Coordinates of C-alpha atoms (C1' of nucleotides) and ligand atoms in Angstrom, one line a residue:
Chain A
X1 CA -9.6 -12.7 4.5
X2 CA -5.7 -14.0 3.5
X3 CA -4.4 -17.8 2.9
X4 CA -3.6 -18.2 7.0
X5 CA -7.2 -17.3 7.6
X6 CA -8.4 -20.2 4.7
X7 CA -6.5 -22.6 6.3
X8 CA -7.7 -21.9 9.7
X9 CA -11.9 -22.1 8.0
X10 CA -10.2 -25.8 6.5
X11 CA -9.0 -26.8 10.1
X12 CA -12.4 -25.5 11.5
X13 CA -14.4 -27.2 9.3
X14 CA -12.3 -30.2 9.2
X15 CA -13.0 -30.7 12.3
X16 CA -9.1 -30.7 13.3
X17 CA -9.6 -27.5 15.7
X18 CA -12.3 -26.5 18.0
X19 CA -10.9 -23.3 18.6
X20 CA -8.1 -21.5 17.2
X21 CA -5.1 -19.5 20.0
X22 CA -2.7 -18.2 18.5
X23 CA 0.5 -15.3 19.6
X24 CA 2.8 -13.0 19.4
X25 CA 6.0 -14.2 20.5
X26 CA 8.7 -10.6 20.1
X27 CA 12.1 -11.7 21.4
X28 CA 12.6 -8.6 24.0
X29 CA 15.7 -7.4 21.8
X30 CA 14.2 -3.4 21.3
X31 CA 11.4 -1.9 20.5
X32 CA 8.2 -2.9 18.1
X33 CA 7.8 -1.4 15.2
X34 CA 5.4 -1.2 11.5
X35 CA 6.6 -4.4 11.1
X36 CA 5.3 -5.9 14.6
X37 CA 1.8 -4.8 14.5
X38 CA 1.7 -6.2 10.9
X39 CA 2.2 -9.6 13.1
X40 CA 0.1 -8.1 16.2
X41 CA -3.3 -7.1 14.1
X42 CA -2.4 -11.2 11.9
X43 CA -2.0 -13.0 15.4
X44 CA -4.5 -10.9 17.9
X45 CA -7.1 -10.5 15.4
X46 CA -8.0 -13.3 14.4
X47 CA -7.8 -14.5 17.6
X48 CA -10.6 -11.8 17.8
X49 CA -12.5 -12.6 14.9
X50 CA -12.6 -16.5 15.8
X51 CA -13.7 -16.1 19.1
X52 CA -10.3 -17.5 20.2
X53 CA -7.6 -17.2 22.2
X54 CA -3.7 -15.1 21.5
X55 CA -0.9 -15.0 23.8
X56 CA 1.8 -12.6 24.2
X57 CA 4.7 -14.9 24.0
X58 CA 8.5 -13.5 25.2
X59 CA 11.6 -15.3 23.2
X60 CA 13.8 -15.0 25.8
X61 CA 16.4 -17.4 25.1
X62 CA 19.1 -15.6 24.4
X63 CA 19.7 -13.4 28.0
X64 CA 23.0 -11.9 25.8
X65 CA 20.5 -10.0 23.9
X66 CA 17.5 -8.9 25.2
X67 CA 17.0 -6.3 28.2
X68 CA 13.9 -5.3 31.1
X69 CA 13.6 -2.2 29.2
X70 CA 12.1 -4.0 26.0
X71 CA 9.5 -6.4 27.9
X72 CA 7.9 -3.5 29.5
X73 CA 7.7 -1.7 26.1
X74 CA 6.1 -4.3 24.1
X75 CA 3.7 -4.6 26.8
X76 CA 2.7 -1.3 26.4
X77 CA 2.5 -1.2 22.5
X78 CA 0.5 -4.2 21.9
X79 CA -1.9 -2.7 24.6
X80 CA -1.4 0.4 22.9
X81 CA -2.8 -0.8 19.5
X82 CA -5.7 -1.7 20.7
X83 CA -5.0 -5.6 21.4
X84 CA -5.5 -7.8 24.3
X85 CA -3.3 -11.0 25.0
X86 CA -4.6 -13.3 26.8
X87 CA -3.9 -14.5 30.2
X88 CA -1.3 -13.1 31.9
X89 CA 2.2 -12.7 29.7
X90 CA 4.6 -15.5 29.1
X91 CA 8.0 -16.3 28.8
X92 CA 10.3 -19.1 27.2
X93 CA 12.0 -18.7 30.8
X94 CA 8.5 -20.5 32.0
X95 CA 9.6 -23.0 30.1
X96 CA 13.5 -23.6 30.6
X97 CA 12.7 -26.6 32.8
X98 CA 10.8 -27.9 30.5
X99 CA 13.0 -27.6 27.7
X100 CA 15.7 -29.1 29.6
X101 CA 13.1 -32.3 30.7
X102 CA 13.1 -32.8 26.8
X103 CA 16.4 -32.1 26.1
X104 CA 16.5 -35.1 28.2
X105 CA 13.6 -37.2 26.8
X106 CA 15.7 -36.6 23.3
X107 CA 19.3 -37.8 24.7
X108 CA 17.5 -40.6 26.4
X109 CA 16.2 -41.3 23.2
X110 CA 19.2 -40.9 21.3
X111 CA 18.7 -38.1 19.3
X112 CA 20.8 -35.3 21.0
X113 CA 24.8 -35.4 21.8
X114 CA 27.1 -33.0 23.9
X115 CA 29.3 -32.6 21.0
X116 CA 32.2 -31.1 21.7
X117 CA 33.6 -29.6 18.5
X118 CA 34.7 -25.7 18.6
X119 CA 32.2 -23.2 17.0
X120 CA 34.8 -23.1 13.9
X121 CA 34.6 -26.1 13.8
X122 CA 31.3 -27.1 13.7
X123 CA 31.0 -24.9 10.7
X124 CA 33.4 -27.1 9.1
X125 CA 32.2 -30.0 9.7
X126 CA 28.6 -28.7 8.7
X127 CA 28.8 -28.5 4.9
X128 CA 27.3 -26.1 2.1
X129 CA 24.7 -25.4 0.4
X130 CA 25.4 -27.5 -2.0
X131 CA 28.3 -30.2 -0.5
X132 CA 27.1 -32.3 2.6
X133 CA 28.4 -31.9 6.0
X134 CA 29.8 -34.6 7.7
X135 CA 29.1 -36.2 11.3
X136 CA 31.4 -34.9 14.2
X137 CA 33.8 -37.0 15.6
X138 CA 31.1 -37.4 19.4
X139 CA 28.4 -38.0 17.7
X140 CA 27.9 -41.7 18.9
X141 CA 28.6 -40.9 22.5
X142 CA 26.1 -43.4 24.8
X143 CA 22.7 -42.0 26.6
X144 CA 25.0 -42.0 29.7
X145 CA 28.6 -39.8 27.8
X146 CA 25.3 -37.8 26.7
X147 CA 23.2 -36.8 29.9
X148 CA 26.7 -37.1 31.8
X149 CA 27.5 -34.7 29.6
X150 CA 24.7 -32.6 29.7
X151 CA 24.6 -32.1 33.0
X152 CA 27.5 -31.1 33.3
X153 CA 27.3 -28.3 31.0
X154 CA 24.4 -27.5 33.1
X155 CA 26.5 -27.6 36.0
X156 CA 28.7 -24.8 34.4
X157 CA 31.5 -28.0 34.1
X158 CA 31.8 -26.7 30.2
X159 CA 34.2 -23.1 29.3
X160 CA 31.1 -22.1 26.6
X161 CA 32.1 -22.8 23.2
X162 CA 33.8 -26.0 24.6
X163 CA 30.8 -27.7 23.7
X164 CA 27.2 -27.7 22.9
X165 CA 24.1 -29.9 22.8
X166 CA 23.3 -31.1 19.6
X167 CA 20.1 -32.9 17.1
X168 CA 21.6 -36.0 16.7
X169 CA 19.9 -35.5 12.8
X170 CA 21.2 -36.2 8.9
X171 CA 24.6 -34.4 8.4
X172 CA 24.2 -34.4 4.9
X173 CA 19.7 -33.6 4.9
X174 CA 19.7 -30.7 1.7
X175 CA 17.7 -28.9 5.0
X176 CA 20.9 -27.2 6.2
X177 CA 18.5 -26.8 9.9
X178 CA 18.4 -30.1 10.1
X179 CA 22.5 -30.5 10.1
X180 CA 22.5 -31.2 13.3
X181 CA 21.3 -28.3 14.6
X182 CA 22.5 -27.0 18.3
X183 CA 19.6 -27.4 20.4
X184 CA 21.0 -25.8 23.9
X185 CA 24.9 -23.7 24.1
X186 CA 26.5 -22.4 27.2
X187 CA 26.2 -18.6 27.9
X188 CA 27.1 -17.8 31.7
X189 CA 25.1 -14.3 31.7
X190 CA 22.3 -13.4 33.5
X191 CA 19.2 -13.9 32.5
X192 CA 16.4 -10.9 32.9
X193 CA 14.2 -13.3 33.8
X194 CA 15.9 -16.3 36.2
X195 CA 18.9 -14.9 36.8
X196 CA 21.4 -17.1 37.5
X197 CA 20.0 -19.7 37.5
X198 CA 21.2 -21.4 33.9
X199 CA 24.5 -21.3 32.5
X200 CA 22.7 -22.7 29.3
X201 CA 20.1 -21.7 27.4
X202 CA 18.4 -22.8 24.7
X203 CA 18.1 -22.3 21.1
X204 CA 15.6 -20.4 19.3
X205 CA 13.9 -23.7 17.1
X206 CA 14.1 -26.3 20.2
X207 CA 12.9 -23.6 22.6
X208 CA 10.0 -22.5 20.0
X209 CA 7.7 -25.5 19.0
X210 CA 8.0 -26.8 22.4
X211 CA 6.4 -23.6 23.7
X212 CA 3.9 -23.6 21.1
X213 CA 2.8 -26.5 22.0
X214 CA 2.8 -25.9 25.9
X215 CA 0.8 -23.3 25.8
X216 CA -2.0 -25.1 23.0
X217 CA -0.9 -22.9 20.3
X218 CA -3.3 -24.0 17.4
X219 CA -2.1 -21.8 14.1
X220 CA 1.8 -20.9 14.9
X221 CA 2.1 -17.7 12.4
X222 CA 5.5 -16.1 11.6
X223 CA 7.7 -14.3 8.4
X224 CA 9.5 -16.5 6.1
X225 CA 12.2 -17.4 6.8
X226 CA 11.8 -19.6 8.6
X227 CA 10.1 -21.8 6.2
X228 CA 13.1 -24.3 6.0
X229 CA 12.8 -23.8 9.8
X230 CA 9.8 -25.8 9.9
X231 CA 11.5 -29.1 8.9
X232 CA 13.1 -28.7 13.1
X233 CA 10.4 -27.5 14.6
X234 CA 7.9 -30.9 13.5
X235 CA 10.8 -32.8 14.0
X236 CA 11.6 -32.0 17.9
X237 CA 7.5 -32.3 18.6
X238 CA 7.5 -35.4 16.4
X239 CA 10.4 -36.8 18.5
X240 CA 9.2 -35.9 22.7
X241 CA 6.1 -37.1 23.9
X242 CA 4.1 -33.9 23.7
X243 CA 0.2 -34.5 23.6
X244 CA -0.3 -32.1 20.4
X245 CA 1.8 -30.0 17.3
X246 CA 0.5 -26.9 16.1
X247 CA 1.4 -25.6 13.1
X248 CA 3.5 -23.3 11.7
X249 CA 2.4 -21.3 8.5
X250 CA 4.6 -18.6 7.1
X251 CA 3.6 -15.0 5.9
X252 CA 5.8 -12.2 4.1
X253 CA 7.1 -9.7 6.7
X254 CA 6.5 -6.0 5.7
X255 CA 8.7 -3.8 4.2
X256 CA 8.6 -0.3 3.8
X257 CA 10.1 1.5 1.6
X258 CA 12.9 4.9 2.8
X259 CA 12.7 3.0 6.0
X260 CA 14.6 -0.2 7.4
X261 CA 12.4 -2.4 9.8
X262 CA 16.2 -4.4 11.2
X263 CA 16.2 -4.0 15.0
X264 CA 19.7 -4.6 14.6
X265 CA 20.3 -1.2 11.8
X266 CA 17.3 0.5 13.9
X267 CA 18.8 0.1 17.3
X268 CA 22.5 1.6 16.0
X269 CA 20.6 5.0 14.6
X270 CA 19.7 4.8 18.3
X271 CA 22.5 3.7 19.8
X272 CA 24.8 6.1 17.8
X273 CA 22.2 9.3 18.6
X274 CA 21.1 9.7 14.9
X275 CA 17.8 10.1 15.9
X276 CA 16.7 10.7 19.5
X277 CA 15.3 7.3 21.1
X278 CA 13.7 4.3 19.7
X279 CA 10.4 6.7 20.0
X280 CA 12.2 9.4 17.6
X281 CA 9.2 10.7 15.7
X282 CA 11.0 9.4 12.5
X283 CA 11.4 6.0 13.4
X284 CA 9.0 3.4 12.1
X285 CA 8.7 2.0 15.8
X286 CA 5.1 2.0 17.5
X287 CA 5.7 4.2 19.7
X288 CA 7.7 6.4 17.2
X289 CA 4.8 6.1 14.8
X290 CA 2.9 7.0 18.1
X291 CA 5.3 9.8 19.1
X292 CA 4.6 11.5 16.1
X293 CA 0.9 11.6 15.7
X294 CA 0.0 8.0 14.4
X295 CA -3.5 6.6 16.1
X296 CA -3.3 2.9 16.7
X297 CA -6.6 3.0 14.5
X298 CA -4.8 4.0 11.1
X299 CA -2.0 1.5 11.8
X300 CA -4.1 -1.6 12.7
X301 CA -6.2 0.3 9.3
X302 CA -2.6 0.4 7.2
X303 CA -2.5 -3.2 8.5
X304 CA -5.3 -4.2 8.3
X305 CA -5.1 -3.0 3.7
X306 CA -1.3 -4.5 3.0
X307 CA -2.8 -7.8 3.2
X308 CA -1.0 -11.6 4.6
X309 CA 0.5 -12.9 1.8
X310 CA 4.0 -15.4 1.1
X311 CA 5.5 -12.5 -1.5
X312 CA 8.4 -10.6 -1.0
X313 CA 6.6 -6.7 -0.9
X314 CA 7.5 -3.1 0.2
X315 CA 4.9 -0.5 0.6
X316 CA 5.4 3.0 -0.6
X317 CA 5.6 5.8 2.3
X318 CA 2.2 7.0 0.4
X319 CA 0.0 4.3 1.9
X320 CA 0.8 4.3 5.2
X321 CA 0.6 7.8 5.0
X322 CA -2.5 7.7 3.0
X323 CA -3.9 5.8 6.3
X324 CA -3.1 9.0 9.2
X325 CA -4.9 10.9 6.7
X326 CA -7.9 9.5 5.9
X327 CA -8.6 9.0 9.7
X328 CA -6.9 12.3 11.4
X329 CA -8.7 14.1 7.9
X330 CA -11.9 13.2 9.7
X331 CA -11.4 13.8 12.9
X332 CA -8.6 17.0 13.8
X333 CA -10.2 20.2 14.2
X334 CA -8.8 22.5 12.2
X335 CA -6.5 25.6 13.9
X336 CA -3.7 28.0 12.6
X337 CA 0.1 28.3 12.4
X338 CA 2.5 29.7 10.6
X339 CA 5.1 27.8 10.2
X340 CA 7.6 30.2 8.7
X341 CA 6.2 33.9 9.4
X342 CA 6.6 37.2 7.6
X343 CA 4.4 40.2 9.4
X344 CA 2.2 41.5 8.1
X345 CA 0.2 45.0 8.6
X346 CA -3.2 46.6 8.1
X347 CA -1.8 50.3 7.7
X348 CA -5.4 50.5 7.0
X349 CA -7.1 48.9 10.4
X350 CA -7.9 50.7 13.6
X351 CA -7.8 49.7 16.8
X352 CA -6.3 47.3 19.4
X353 CA -7.6 44.4 17.1
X354 CA -11.2 42.5 17.8
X355 CA -12.2 38.9 17.5
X356 CA -13.1 36.7 14.6
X357 CA -15.2 33.1 14.8
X358 CA -13.6 30.7 12.9
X359 CA -15.1 26.3 12.7
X360 CA -13.1 23.2 13.9
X361 CA -13.9 21.5 11.2
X362 CA -15.5 23.0 7.8
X363 CA -16.7 20.1 6.4
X364 CA -18.7 19.0 10.5
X365 CA -19.9 21.9 11.7
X366 CA -21.4 20.2 14.9
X367 CA -17.9 20.2 16.4
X368 CA -18.4 23.8 17.5
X369 CA -17.1 27.5 16.3
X370 CA -14.2 29.1 17.6
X371 CA -12.6 32.9 18.9
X372 CA -9.9 34.0 17.2
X373 CA -8.3 37.5 17.6
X374 CA -7.9 39.7 14.6
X375 CA -5.5 42.5 14.7
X376 CA -3.5 45.0 12.2
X377 CA -0.3 43.3 12.7
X378 CA -1.1 39.7 12.0
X379 CA 1.9 37.6 10.3
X380 CA 1.3 34.7 7.3
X381 CA 4.2 32.6 5.8
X382 CA 6.0 34.0 3.7
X383 CA 5.1 31.3 0.6
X384 CA 1.9 33.0 0.7
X385 CA 3.0 36.2 -0.7
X386 CA 5.1 36.6 -4.1
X387 CA 5.5 40.0 -5.3
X388 CA 5.0 38.8 -8.9
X389 CA 4.6 35.1 -11.1
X390 CA 2.0 33.5 -12.6
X391 CA -1.6 33.2 -13.0
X392 CA -2.2 30.2 -11.1
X393 CA -0.7 31.6 -8.1
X394 CA -3.9 31.8 -5.8
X395 CA -2.2 33.6 -2.9
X396 CA -0.7 36.9 -2.2
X397 CA 0.2 39.4 -5.4
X398 CA 2.1 42.4 -4.5
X399 CA -0.8 44.6 -6.5
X400 CA -3.6 42.1 -5.3
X401 CA -6.0 40.4 -2.7
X402 CA -6.3 37.7 -1.4
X403 CA -9.2 36.6 1.7
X404 CA -7.3 35.7 4.8
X405 CA -7.8 32.4 7.0
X406 CA -11.9 33.3 8.9
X407 CA -11.3 36.9 8.2
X408 CA -10.9 39.8 5.8
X409 CA -10.0 39.7 2.0
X410 CA -6.1 41.9 2.7
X411 CA -4.9 43.5 -0.7
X412 CA -1.3 44.2 -0.8
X413 CA -0.1 47.4 -1.7
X414 CA 3.6 47.6 -0.6
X415 CA 6.3 45.8 1.3
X416 CA 10.4 46.3 2.8
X417 CA 13.3 44.3 2.8
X418 CA 16.4 44.3 4.4
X419 CA 20.5 44.8 3.6
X420 CA 20.1 41.5 1.8
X421 CA 17.0 41.9 0.2
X422 CA 14.6 40.0 2.1
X423 CA 11.6 41.4 3.3
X424 CA 10.4 42.1 6.7
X425 CA 7.0 43.3 6.6
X426 CA 3.7 43.7 4.3
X427 CA 1.7 46.6 4.0
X428 CA -2.2 45.8 2.6
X429 CA -5.4 47.4 3.7
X430 CA -8.0 45.1 4.8
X431 CA -11.4 45.2 3.3
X432 CA -13.6 46.9 6.0
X433 CA -16.0 44.5 6.0
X434 CA -15.5 41.1 4.1
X435 CA -16.6 38.2 7.1
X436 CA -7.1 33.4 -3.1
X437 CA -7.0 32.0 0.3
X438 CA -4.5 32.2 2.9
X439 CA -3.7 31.0 6.9
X440 CA -2.3 33.2 9.8
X441 CA -1.7 34.2 13.5
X442 CA -2.2 37.8 15.1
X443 CA 1.0 38.7 16.4
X444 CA 0.0 40.1 19.8
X445 CA -1.8 36.9 20.6
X446 CA 0.7 34.6 19.1
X447 CA 1.5 32.0 20.7
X448 CA 5.6 31.3 20.1
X449 CA 5.0 27.7 19.4
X450 CA 8.1 25.5 17.8
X451 CA 6.8 23.7 14.7
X452 CA 8.5 20.3 14.4
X453 CA 8.9 19.5 10.3
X454 CA 9.4 15.6 9.7
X455 CA 10.6 13.9 6.3
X456 CA 12.1 10.7 5.3
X457 CA 14.7 9.9 7.3
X458 CA 16.4 7.9 4.5
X459 CA 17.2 9.8 1.3
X460 CA 16.5 6.4 -0.6
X461 CA 13.7 4.0 -1.0
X462 CA 15.8 1.3 0.2
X463 CA 19.0 2.1 2.5
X464 CA 18.4 -1.1 4.2
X465 CA 20.2 -2.4 0.7
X466 CA 23.0 0.3 1.3
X467 CA 26.4 -0.6 1.5
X468 CA 26.5 1.9 4.8
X469 CA 22.8 2.8 5.3
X470 CA 24.1 4.8 8.0
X471 CA 25.9 7.4 5.4
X472 CA 22.2 7.3 3.9
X473 CA 20.4 9.7 6.2
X474 CA 18.0 12.2 4.9
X475 CA 19.1 15.8 6.9
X476 CA 16.8 17.3 5.7
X477 CA 14.2 14.3 8.0
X478 CA 14.1 16.9 11.0
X479 CA 13.8 20.6 10.1
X480 CA 12.9 22.8 13.3
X481 CA 10.7 25.5 12.7
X482 CA 10.5 28.8 15.1
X483 CA 7.0 29.8 14.3
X484 CA 3.4 31.4 15.9
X485 CA 0.1 30.4 15.9
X486 CA -3.4 31.1 17.9
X487 CA -3.6 31.4 21.5
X488 CA -6.1 28.5 21.1
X489 CA -2.8 26.0 21.3
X490 CA -2.2 27.5 24.3
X491 CA -4.8 24.9 25.9
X492 CA -3.4 21.8 24.1
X493 CA -2.6 18.1 25.5
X494 CA -0.3 15.7 24.0
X495 CA -2.9 13.0 22.8
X496 CA -4.8 15.6 21.3
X497 CA -4.1 16.4 17.3
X498 CA -5.7 18.7 15.4
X499 CA -5.2 20.2 11.4
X500 CA -3.1 22.9 11.7
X501 CA -5.1 24.8 8.5
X502 CA -3.3 24.2 4.7
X503 CA 0.0 22.4 6.5
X504 CA 0.0 19.7 7.9
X505 CA -2.0 17.3 10.9
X506 CA 0.0 18.1 14.1
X507 CA 0.2 17.2 17.4
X508 CA 1.5 18.8 20.6
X509 CA 4.5 15.9 23.0
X510 CA 7.4 15.5 20.8
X511 CA 9.2 14.8 24.2
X512 CA 9.9 18.4 25.1
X513 CA 6.3 21.2 24.6
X514 CA 7.0 23.3 28.1
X515 CA 4.5 25.0 29.2
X516 CA 6.8 27.8 28.4
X517 CA 8.1 26.3 24.5
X518 CA 5.0 24.4 23.0
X519 CA 6.6 22.2 20.3
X520 CA 4.6 20.6 18.0
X521 CA 4.9 17.5 15.7
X522 CA 3.9 17.8 12.1
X523 CA 2.2 13.8 11.9
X524 CA 1.6 14.3 7.7
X525 CA 1.4 16.9 5.8
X526 CA -1.9 16.7 2.9
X527 CA -1.8 16.0 -0.2
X528 CA -0.4 19.4 -2.3
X529 CA -0.2 18.7 -6.5
Chain B
rG1 C1' 21.6 -28.9 -3.5
rG2 C1' 17.0 -27.1 -0.9
rG3 C1' 13.2 -24.0 0.4
rG4 C1' 9.8 -20.4 -1.3
rU5 C1' 7.7 -16.4 -4.8
rA6 C1' 5.9 -14.5 -9.9
rU7 C1' -1.2 -10.9 -11.8
rC8 C1' -0.9 -2.1 -13.5
rG9 C1' 4.0 1.9 -10.1
rC10 C1' 3.4 -0.3 -4.9
rC11 C1' 0.1 -4.0 -2.5
rA12 C1' -3.2 -7.5 -3.6
rA13 C1' -8.4 -10.5 -5.2
rG14 C1' -11.5 -13.7 -8.8
rC15 C1' -8.9 -20.8 -7.7
rG16 C1' -11.7 -23.0 -14.8
rG17 C1' -15.9 -18.7 -16.4
rU18 C1' -13.4 -14.8 -18.3
rA19 C1' -8.6 -9.2 -15.0
rA20 C1' -12.0 -6.5 -7.3
rG21 C1' -10.4 -4.0 -3.8
rG22 C1' -6.8 0.2 -1.6
rC23 C1' -2.5 3.5 -2.5
rA24 C1' 0.2 5.9 -6.4
rC25 C1' 0.0 8.7 -11.1
rC26 C1' -3.3 11.7 -15.3
rG27 C1' -8.1 14.9 -15.9
rG28 C1' -13.5 17.2 -14.4
rA29 C1' -16.9 18.5 -10.2
rU30 C1' -17.8 21.8 -6.1
rU31 C1' -14.3 24.3 -1.1
rC32 C1' -12.5 30.9 2.2
rU33 C1' -7.6 24.6 4.0
rG34 C1' -4.1 24.4 -3.4
rA35 C1' -7.5 20.1 1.4
rU36 C1' -11.5 17.6 2.2
rU37 C1' -15.7 15.5 -1.1
rC38 C1' -17.1 14.8 -5.9
rC39 C1' -17.0 12.1 -10.4
rG40 C1' -13.9 10.4 -15.4
rG41 C1' -9.2 8.0 -17.3
rA42 C1' -4.6 5.0 -17.9
rG43 C1' -1.7 1.2 -17.3
rG44 C1' -1.3 -5.6 -15.3
rU45 C1' -1.9 -11.6 -15.5
rC46 C1' 7.3 -13.8 -16.1
rG47 C1' 7.8 -16.8 -21.1
rA48 C1' 6.6 -21.0 -23.9
rG49 C1' 3.1 -24.8 -25.0
rG50 C1' -0.2 -29.1 -22.7
rU51 C1' -5.5 -29.6 -21.3
rU52 C1' -11.2 -27.5 -21.9
rC53 C1' -16.2 -24.4 -25.0
rG54 C1' -13.1 -21.2 -22.0
rA55 C1' -7.7 -21.0 -17.8
rA56 C1' -5.3 -15.4 -13.0
rU57 C1' -6.7 -20.4 -12.0
rC58 C1' -4.5 -27.2 -13.8
rC59 C1' 0.0 -30.2 -16.3
rU60 C1' 5.1 -29.2 -18.5
rC61 C1' 9.8 -27.1 -20.2
rG62 C1' 12.0 -23.0 -19.2
rU63 C1' 13.6 -17.9 -16.6
rA64 C1' 13.4 -14.5 -12.7
rC65 C1' 13.7 -12.9 -7.4
rC66 C1' 13.6 -14.1 -2.6
rC67 C1' 15.4 -17.3 1.9
rC68 C1' 18.8 -21.0 3.4
rA69 C1' 25.8 -23.1 5.4
rG70 C1' 24.5 -17.8 13.8
rC71 C1' 26.6 -22.0 20.3
rC72 C1' 20.5 -15.1 16.3
rA73 C1' 15.5 -15.1 16.4
Ligands
AMP1 N1 9.0 -7.2 9.0 C1 8.6 -7.1 9.6 N2 7.3 -7.9 9.2 C2 6.2 -8.6 9.8 N3 6.1 -9.3 10.7 C3 7.3 -8.8 11.4 C4 8.6 -8.1 11.0 N4 9.8 -8.5 12.0 C5 9.2 -9.2 12.5 N5 7.8 -9.8 12.3 C6 6.9 -10.4 13.5 O1 7.3 -10.4 15.0 C7 7.6 -11.7 14.9 C8 8.4 -11.2 16.3 O2 9.7 -10.5 16.4 P1 11.1 -10.6 16.7 O3 11.2 -9.5 17.7 O4 12.4 -10.2 16.1 C9 8.6 -12.4 14.4 O5 8.3 -13.7 14.7 C10 7.4 -12.4 12.9 O6 6.0 -12.6 13.1

RNA sequence: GGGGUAUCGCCAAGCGGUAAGGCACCGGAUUCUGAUUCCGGAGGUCGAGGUUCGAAUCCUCGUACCCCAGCCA
């Protein structure tokens, strides 16, 4: 429960409603992100819990900011998240003829007029946050003049900027949006749905309430910036022949630490190529979180956990992470990899290797076990071996043992380095029978696995507030480590996510893992205190 | 000017009855993942009043922060 669900209950009880019908209206001007996941869960979830319906409407009243590529994707992630919309996919453009008819009703009703003030002029006549606005000189044309002038616009008689249809409200209203907000503006551009049928397009406020009304939306849910805008939402409906009046309710938008949500900023990262695509694993997009290896179920859990309120908030990464962890920790099977390898060599070992039985999930034996190749020329991660240091350091020391993963307790007893004092091999002796702890991969059967380590895209918690958010990117957001993993991973499949023991949770894909180079994405590392 | 919001570190409940819940942090128990799991702790109701037996919840004066001056959504 949250404040919106309480309002829904009150109405259901008060008989104000007999069903709930919500909607998710993204403008197809970019890809969906974690913020849209919060909105998708709210709207689609509410509907399903309340045995109602929820529509997917692409608010496409601005041909110049949107592309078909986006509608294609939006649909994809909405589904991938586990949500189904009611009936066909909608579009504001479907109501483009209804809206025109409504603009004409307002006009006939004397509530709208073709203004001819330039764009700089409408701003000048607009007033300020404290000083009131002033009436346009064209404010009082006749219904005949307005009808005539509107069609003129529609026909293409007027140049872009040369004219716009305005609502005749109150130029001194403390609500700046009520200062004769524009209803229709001229754009000689092609629409991705209506082609070049319309040379005039409707503004958001005009289109939103009407679409909502036509679809029969009971509760229009949106973010807080549209609180003032609600005044125009109710005015439009109140002033036209429409049989329903959907009610708007605003909730705070999600803000995530070390990342940016603005489609404009996200777009920029994508435009300027500072990230691969909208699906780059460091992007907070849905396709991004997906390619990174997040589970729709973990996102829905995230959104569920963060709550819905009217308070500006900024969730820490830690929370998002806890979510994929709590999922993957229980469903992912363990594996063995070495991101930064250093060849160990048990001179004490004789043979061409053998095989050791390993589990698929330590606390879940019913997930089965497996056979893995052992040898005297195995690899380990550098950080595991230490020539010296502390009484807490539970790994390999230049004079002690350690239990290799699911295998033998080796015991270092030498080493060797190169011209730059960098080790190359570590000579140790395996206890004939033993089967701190560490993880390995035999060199003989070591698949050359490219491992991709991801980190926070930005170096500052609130990059958005930075003067140049781009200049504050994290150069180590993606560190590509070539490594070695067990031959098991020879049979990985994009979609499947395993937990490389002791490291993190990894998954294939990343748009790169060919048959030769199995590239892997590190979804999230483990709690490492 | 107008619209909103103020509960530990971050989120966020109890809506007149006396500080949930998640995440973060800090300790202890197990674990061939320093993980998991498991107990234990630290910290909070903007300020100043009023009402009340009692207020986080109602009333008020402050103050702080956010949004609004796109022919963007
Ligand atoms: N950062 C965000 N947090 C929460 N909801 C968001 C966020 N960004 C967009 N939305 C929701 O997604 C809808 C469609 O967004 P557009 O594509 O701008 C909005 O009307 C909001 O309900």
